[PDB]
Design a protein around this ligand. Structure first.
Ligand code: HEM
Ligand SMILES: [C-]#N
Length: 439
């Protein structure tokens, strides 16, 4: 098998990796007008995986991808069952299952008003505006923009880091069926873990759904001064190698909560001190599997973010089923000195989170519910791992093992990540956009 890279929406397989991204959420007002506008739009603007791997000079100023919710497909008379258990009812209907405080959800996410999303990746906010206006011009009254959420890479040496300060987008699965570089420690999975209708996908798909994917979108607000204050108060006093200053102990506690230092260095490889060169080295920063820390927490807590969401050898061996592609971007202004000093969030900032998989229940949802929210996961450990401190949602939010010299001590961690909404979308193949969606 050879994946048709020219027909796969690029953010799914390759990732836009643009400095700015905008999610333009819309409702369809008139199906006929929308469909003809869509046929005009697709060949000009929808960006394939092939374009994303092309020379930066062959590339457009902005990349655009497009997904639909269940109600969006219904509004367009696209009535064939896509085979996913969660997609049809939308994410709000699933939010309590995810552990969300529903009182924090806001319109237009609180229901099924959203019909789809244009994802625009570009280099400047002005360019996002140009391509948003282009959507408005092309689609006119056939749509209503119900929300737009815009993100940006953080400035300077924080580019690629999320708002708590940690380098993100390091670990991704590699799919077979195309010519790609595989890094040491990277999962190698069949393409149908990510792409509907391909080998590895067990869902019952219409033929036209080949080479699409499901997006789990989440809007997270982050409480950065609060996280900072917590790590400073609970700074680890020492580790195996020696004694830590308050700053060092706070950085270390954050690293223990995530499973990586802010630099990206995985604690399984760098358990006592940061190694920024390692964090920046794709040939080594994923070359670990917890095999040297399966039954103790000195090297890594059992419940660290990355360990919960990708358990590696905690599962007993490689498992292809539960991998997903991520394409998230931070949003909001930098955290001010006043905010940090006060320990209190004044401004809205966070993460626009995007995860792609063929089966929602096996990717995002499995990572969230079965793993992160489950105090008894990973299984068969000598002590209870607890709730994933970053995004685990079960109460009490107690996690063990954060102090490598006092592993039995538990930490009750305030929730620093607040879901404000989200949706489940299907991104069709590029051909399906015009041959099926717009038919
Ligand atoms: C604001 C919320 C979140 C923040 C700040 C955050 C941050 C991070 C960071 C810093 C990493 C390490 C970089 C890497 O290994 O690629 C990471 C990895 C990861 N996160 Fe998150 N994350 C968030 C939410 C989520 C959620 C909700 C899920 C899924 C339910 C998730 C799933 C993953 C996965 C699968 C990895 C890669 C794990 C691996 O392959 O080793 N994250 N995240
Ligand atoms: C995590 N992204």
């Amino acid at each position: 098998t050879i994946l048709p890279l020219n027909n796969i929406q690029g953010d799914i397989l390759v990732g836009m990796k643009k400095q700015k991204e905008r999610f333009v959420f819309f409702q369809v007002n008139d199906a006929t007008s929308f469909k003809t506008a869509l046929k005009t739009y697709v060949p000009e603007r929808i960006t394939s995986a092939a374009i994303l791997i092309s020379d930066p000079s062959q590339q457009p100023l902005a990349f655009v991808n497009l997904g639909f919710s269940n109600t969006g497909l219904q509004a367009l008379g696209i009535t064939d069952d896509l085979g996913d258990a969660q997609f049809p009812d939308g994410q709000f209907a699933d939010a309590a299952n995810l552990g969300d405080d529903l009182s924090q959800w806001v319109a237009p996410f609180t229901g099924t008003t959203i019909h789809g999303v244009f994802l625009i990746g570009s280099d400047q906010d002005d360019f996002l505006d140009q391509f948003t206006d282009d959507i408005s011009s092309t689609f006119g009254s056939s749509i209503t923009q119900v929300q737009a959420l815009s993100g940006s890479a953080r400035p300077g040496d924080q580019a690629g880091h999320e708002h708590f300060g940690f380098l993100n987008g390091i670990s991704q699965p590699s799919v077979t069926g195309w010519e790609t570089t595989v890094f040491p420690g990277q999962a190698v999975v069949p393409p149908g873990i990510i792409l509907t209708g391909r080998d590895g996908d067990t869902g019952t798909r219409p033929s036209w759904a080949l080479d699409g994917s499901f997006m789990a979108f989440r809007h997270f607000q982050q409480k950065v001064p609060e996280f900072n204050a917590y790590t400073l108060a609970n700074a680890i006093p020492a580790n195996s190698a020696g004694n830590l200053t308050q700053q060092e102990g706070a950085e270390f506690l954050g690293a223990r909560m995530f499973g990586r230092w802010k630099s990206g260095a995985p604690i399984d490889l760098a358990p006592t001190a940061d190694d920024p060169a390692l964090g920046a080295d794709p040939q080594r920063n994923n070359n670990f599997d917890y095999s040297d820390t399966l039954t103790d927490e000195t090297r890594c807590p059992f419940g660290a973010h990355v360990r919960k969401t990708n358990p590696r050898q905690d599962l007993g061996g490689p498992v292809d089923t539960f991998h997903a592609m991520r394409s998230s971007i931070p949003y909001g202004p930098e955290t001010s000195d006043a905010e940090l000093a006060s320990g209190v969030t004044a401004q809205d900032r966070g993460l626009l989170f995007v995860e792609y998989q063929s089966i929602i229940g096996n990717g995002f949802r499995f990572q969230q519910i079965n793993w992160a929210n489950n105090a008894n996961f990973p299984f068969s450990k000598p002590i209870t791992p607890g709730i994933e401190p970053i995004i685990g949602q079960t109460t009490p939010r107690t996690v063990g093992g954060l102090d490598p010299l006092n592993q039995n001590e538990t930490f009750t961690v305030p929730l620093f990540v607040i879901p404000k909404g989200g949706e489940y979308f299907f991104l069709p193949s590029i051909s399906a956009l015009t041959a099926t969606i717009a038919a």
